[PDB]
Amino acid sequence: DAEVQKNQVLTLEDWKEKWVTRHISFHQEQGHQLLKKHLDTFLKGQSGLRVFFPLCGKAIEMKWFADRGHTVVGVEISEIGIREFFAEQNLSYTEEPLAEIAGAKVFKSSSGSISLYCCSIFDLPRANIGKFDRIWDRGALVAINPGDHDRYADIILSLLRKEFQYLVAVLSYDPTKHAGPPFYVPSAELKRLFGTKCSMQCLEEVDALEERHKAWGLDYLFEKLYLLTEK
Ligand SMILES: Nc1ncnc2c1ncn2[C@@H]1O[C@H](CSCC[C@H](N)C(=O)O)[C@@H](O)[C@H]1O
What we know:
Layout: H1 12-21, H2 33-43, E1 50-53, H3 61-67, E2 71-75, H4 79-88, E3 93-97, E4 105-109, E5 114-118, E6 132-137, H5 149-158, E7 160-172, H6 187-194, E8 198-207, E9 222-230
Parallel strand pairs: 1-2, 1-6, 2-5, 6-7
Antiparallel strand pairs: 3-4, 4-5, 7-9, 8-9
The structure holds S-adenosyl-L-homocysteine.
S-adenosyl-L-homocysteine binds at residues 12, 15, 26-27, 55-57, 59, 75-78, 81, 120-122, 138-140, 143.
Protein backbone atom coordinates (compact mmCIF):
# COMPACT_ATOMS: atom_id res chain seq x y z
CA ASP A 1 0.00 0.00 0.00
CA ALA A 2 2.92 2.25 0.66
CA GLU A 3 4.05 0.75 -2.72
CA VAL A 4 0.80 1.43 -4.64
CA GLN A 5 1.93 4.82 -5.96
CA LYS A 6 5.52 3.82 -6.36
CA ASN A 7 5.57 4.34 -10.11
CA GLN A 8 3.47 7.49 -10.31
CA VAL A 9 5.09 10.65 -11.77
CA LEU A 10 4.35 14.26 -12.35
CA THR A 11 7.05 15.96 -14.38
CA LEU A 12 8.55 19.45 -14.02
CA GLU A 13 6.59 20.50 -17.10
CA ASP A 14 3.37 19.17 -15.66
CA TRP A 15 3.86 21.28 -12.57
CA LYS A 16 4.64 24.36 -14.65
CA GLU A 17 1.44 23.72 -16.67
CA LYS A 18 -0.61 23.52 -13.52
CA TRP A 19 0.54 27.09 -12.74
CA VAL A 20 -0.07 28.35 -16.27
CA THR A 21 -3.56 26.86 -16.32
CA ARG A 22 -4.42 27.81 -12.70
CA HIS A 23 -4.69 24.28 -11.30
CA ILE A 24 -3.27 25.31 -7.93
CA SER A 25 -5.64 23.74 -5.37
CA PHE A 26 -2.77 23.05 -3.04
CA HIS A 27 -2.37 26.68 -2.16
CA GLN A 28 -3.66 27.88 1.22
CA GLU A 29 -4.68 31.56 0.97
CA GLN A 30 -4.87 31.89 4.78
CA GLY A 31 -1.67 29.97 5.49
CA HIS A 32 -1.15 26.67 7.16
CA GLN A 33 -2.89 26.48 10.50
CA LEU A 34 -0.70 23.91 12.14
CA LEU A 35 2.42 25.94 11.39
CA LYS A 36 0.62 28.99 12.78
CA LYS A 37 -0.06 27.05 15.98
CA HIS A 38 3.49 25.77 16.31
CA LEU A 39 5.39 28.77 14.97
CA ASP A 40 6.40 30.44 18.21
CA THR A 41 7.88 27.32 19.58
CA PHE A 42 9.50 26.58 16.25
CA LEU A 43 11.30 29.93 16.55
CA LYS A 44 11.31 30.10 20.30
CA GLY A 45 14.17 32.32 21.53
CA GLN A 46 16.02 32.38 18.27
CA SER A 47 16.91 35.34 16.07
CA GLY A 48 17.99 35.60 12.46
CA LEU A 49 17.43 31.94 11.58
CA ARG A 50 17.95 30.72 8.03
CA VAL A 51 14.73 28.93 7.00
CA PHE A 52 14.25 26.81 3.85
CA PHE A 53 10.95 26.09 2.08
CA PRO A 54 11.25 23.21 -0.41
CA LEU A 55 8.78 23.28 -3.28
CA CYS A 56 7.51 26.57 -2.02
CA GLY A 57 4.96 27.65 -4.56
CA LYS A 58 3.71 31.02 -3.30
CA ALA A 59 3.48 29.84 0.29
CA ILE A 60 2.33 32.85 2.30
CA GLU A 61 4.18 31.69 5.42
CA MET A 62 7.51 32.66 3.90
CA LYS A 63 6.44 36.21 4.69
CA TRP A 64 5.67 35.24 8.31
CA PHE A 65 9.28 34.20 8.82
CA ALA A 66 10.73 37.16 6.96
CA ASP A 67 8.62 39.61 9.00
CA ARG A 68 10.09 38.13 12.19
CA GLY A 69 13.64 38.78 11.06
CA HIS A 70 14.55 35.37 9.71
CA THR A 71 16.17 34.73 6.32
CA VAL A 72 14.04 32.69 3.91
CA VAL A 73 15.02 30.63 0.92
CA GLY A 74 12.66 28.69 -1.28
CA VAL A 75 12.90 26.58 -4.44
CA GLU A 76 10.11 26.51 -7.02
CA ILE A 77 10.16 25.37 -10.68
CA SER A 78 7.35 27.78 -11.67
CA GLU A 79 8.33 31.33 -12.37
CA ILE A 80 4.65 32.20 -12.45
CA GLY A 81 4.22 31.05 -8.85
CA ILE A 82 7.32 32.90 -7.71
CA ARG A 83 6.23 36.16 -9.27
CA GLU A 84 2.77 35.65 -7.80
CA PHE A 85 4.26 35.29 -4.31
CA PHE A 86 5.88 38.72 -4.50
CA ALA A 87 2.81 40.34 -5.99
CA GLU A 88 0.52 38.84 -3.35
CA GLN A 89 2.83 39.73 -0.48
CA ASN A 90 3.39 43.24 -1.91
CA LEU A 91 7.18 42.98 -2.10
CA SER A 92 9.59 44.35 -4.73
CA TYR A 93 12.24 41.99 -5.98
CA THR A 94 15.26 41.54 -8.27
CA GLU A 95 15.85 38.74 -10.75
CA GLU A 96 19.31 37.34 -11.56
CA PRO A 97 20.22 34.39 -13.82
CA LEU A 98 21.79 31.41 -11.98
CA ALA A 99 25.08 30.70 -13.71
CA GLU A 100 25.38 27.14 -12.39
CA ILE A 101 21.96 25.95 -13.68
CA ALA A 102 20.98 26.43 -17.29
CA GLY A 103 18.04 28.70 -17.75
CA ALA A 104 17.37 29.16 -14.06
CA LYS A 105 16.81 32.39 -12.17
CA VAL A 106 16.80 33.65 -8.60
CA PHE A 107 14.27 36.18 -7.39
CA LYS A 108 15.14 38.11 -4.24
CA SER A 109 13.18 40.60 -2.21
CA SER A 110 14.78 44.02 -2.41
CA SER A 111 16.57 43.85 0.97
CA GLY A 112 17.18 40.13 0.69
CA SER A 113 14.94 38.60 3.33
CA ILE A 114 13.39 36.19 0.80
CA SER A 115 15.21 34.41 -2.05
CA LEU A 116 13.23 32.11 -4.34
CA TYR A 117 15.25 29.92 -6.68
CA CYS A 118 13.54 29.08 -9.92
CA CYS A 119 14.87 25.62 -10.67
CA SER A 120 14.32 22.02 -9.69
CA ILE A 121 15.18 21.11 -6.12
CA PHE A 122 17.28 18.32 -7.66
CA ASP A 123 19.53 20.93 -9.26
CA LEU A 124 19.54 23.38 -6.36
CA PRO A 125 22.65 22.00 -4.66
CA ARG A 126 24.74 23.60 -7.44
CA ALA A 127 23.38 27.07 -6.59
CA ASN A 128 25.44 27.14 -3.38
CA ILE A 129 22.74 28.14 -0.97
CA GLY A 130 24.39 27.02 2.31
CA LYS A 131 22.62 25.40 5.23
CA PHE A 132 19.56 26.09 7.30
CA ASP A 133 18.43 26.20 10.86
CA ARG A 134 14.80 25.42 9.98
CA ILE A 135 12.93 23.64 7.21
CA TRP A 136 9.17 23.96 6.66
CA ASP A 137 7.97 21.09 4.38
CA ARG A 138 4.32 21.10 3.28
CA GLY A 139 3.08 20.15 -0.17
CA ALA A 140 6.75 19.35 -0.72
CA LEU A 141 7.72 15.81 0.39
CA VAL A 142 4.16 14.84 -0.56
CA ALA A 143 4.53 16.46 -3.97
CA ILE A 144 7.75 14.67 -4.90
CA ASN A 145 7.36 11.62 -7.06
CA PRO A 146 7.63 8.53 -4.82
CA GLY A 147 10.58 7.28 -6.90
CA ASP A 148 12.45 10.44 -6.04
CA HIS A 149 12.08 10.18 -2.28
CA ASP A 150 15.66 8.99 -1.54
CA ARG A 151 17.19 11.71 -3.68
CA TYR A 152 14.92 14.31 -2.10
CA ALA A 153 15.76 13.23 1.44
CA ASP A 154 19.46 13.32 0.88
CA ILE A 155 19.18 16.87 -0.44
CA ILE A 156 17.16 17.94 2.58
CA LEU A 157 19.63 16.31 4.89
CA SER A 158 22.53 18.03 3.08
CA LEU A 159 20.90 21.36 3.79
CA LEU A 160 20.65 21.01 7.56
CA ARG A 161 22.99 22.54 10.04
CA LYS A 162 24.14 20.36 12.93
CA GLU A 163 21.31 21.65 15.08
CA PHE A 164 17.98 22.12 13.36
CA GLN A 165 14.21 21.90 13.47
CA TYR A 166 12.50 20.33 10.48
CA LEU A 167 8.71 20.38 10.38
CA VAL A 168 7.07 18.21 7.79
CA ALA A 169 3.36 17.85 7.03
CA VAL A 170 2.05 14.68 5.44
CA LEU A 171 -1.37 13.33 4.54
CA SER A 172 -2.81 10.00 5.42
CA TYR A 173 -5.35 8.50 3.01
CA ASP A 174 -6.02 5.29 1.06
CA PRO A 175 -3.64 5.46 -1.87
CA THR A 176 -5.48 2.85 -3.88
CA LYS A 177 -8.24 5.50 -4.08
CA HIS A 178 -6.24 8.38 -5.49
CA ALA A 179 -3.24 8.93 -7.70
CA GLY A 180 -1.13 11.76 -6.11
CA PRO A 181 0.05 14.45 -5.77
CA PRO A 182 -0.23 14.83 -2.93
CA PHE A 183 1.20 11.36 -2.62
CA TYR A 184 0.68 9.12 0.41
CA VAL A 185 3.67 9.32 2.72
CA PRO A 186 3.21 7.27 5.84
CA SER A 187 5.12 7.48 9.11
CA ALA A 188 7.15 4.43 8.13
CA GLU A 189 8.45 6.20 5.00
CA LEU A 190 9.37 9.29 7.00
CA LYS A 191 11.29 6.98 9.25
CA ARG A 192 12.98 5.19 6.34
CA LEU A 193 14.03 8.54 4.94
CA PHE A 194 15.18 10.54 7.92
CA GLY A 195 15.19 8.44 11.07
CA THR A 196 18.85 7.40 11.13
CA LYS A 197 19.89 11.04 11.04
CA CYS A 198 16.85 12.56 12.78
CA SER A 199 14.90 12.20 16.00
CA MET A 200 11.18 12.25 15.25
CA GLN A 201 8.11 13.31 17.13
CA CYS A 202 4.54 13.45 15.93
CA LEU A 203 3.08 16.79 17.00
CA GLU A 204 -0.40 16.52 15.47
CA GLU A 205 -2.97 14.39 13.63
CA VAL A 206 -5.98 16.43 12.29
CA ASP A 207 -8.99 15.78 10.15
CA ALA A 208 -8.58 17.24 6.69
CA LEU A 209 -11.45 15.57 4.93
CA GLU A 210 -13.27 18.20 2.88
CA GLU A 211 -16.20 17.11 0.69
CA ARG A 212 -13.92 18.31 -2.14
CA HIS A 213 -12.24 14.96 -1.33
CA LYS A 214 -15.62 13.29 -1.87
CA ALA A 215 -15.51 12.76 -5.60
CA TRP A 216 -11.80 12.11 -5.12
CA GLY A 217 -13.06 8.83 -3.66
CA LEU A 218 -11.63 9.42 -0.19
CA ASP A 219 -13.65 8.76 2.99
CA TYR A 220 -10.74 9.53 5.33
CA LEU A 221 -7.94 12.12 5.16
CA PHE A 222 -5.87 13.16 8.05
CA GLU A 223 -2.97 15.66 8.19
CA LYS A 224 -0.01 14.73 10.41
CA LEU A 225 2.74 17.07 11.52
CA TYR A 226 6.17 15.74 12.48
CA LEU A 227 9.09 17.51 14.11
CA LEU A 228 12.51 16.19 13.13
CA THR A 229 15.61 17.27 15.07
CA GLU A 230 19.23 16.12 15.48
CA LYS A 231 19.53 12.53 16.77
N1 LIG B 1 11.40 19.17 -8.52
C1 LIG B 1 10.70 20.31 -8.21
N2 LIG B 1 11.52 21.38 -8.00
C2 LIG B 1 10.92 22.57 -7.67
N3 LIG B 1 9.58 22.81 -7.53
C3 LIG B 1 8.86 21.71 -7.77
C4 LIG B 1 9.33 20.47 -8.09
N4 LIG B 1 8.26 19.65 -8.23
C5 LIG B 1 7.18 20.38 -7.99
N5 LIG B 1 7.51 21.67 -7.70
C6 LIG B 1 6.62 22.75 -7.34
O1 LIG B 1 6.28 22.22 -5.99
C7 LIG B 1 5.02 22.81 -5.62
C8 LIG B 1 4.14 21.75 -4.95
S1 LIG B 1 2.52 22.31 -4.43
C9 LIG B 1 2.82 23.04 -2.79
C10 LIG B 1 3.25 24.52 -2.85
C11 LIG B 1 3.55 25.10 -1.47
N6 LIG B 1 4.61 24.34 -0.77
C12 LIG B 1 2.27 25.22 -0.63
O2 LIG B 1 2.36 24.68 0.51
O3 LIG B 1 1.31 25.81 -1.15
C13 LIG B 1 4.41 23.45 -6.91
O4 LIG B 1 4.43 24.87 -6.72
C14 LIG B 1 5.26 22.90 -8.03
O5 LIG B 1 5.52 23.71 -9.17
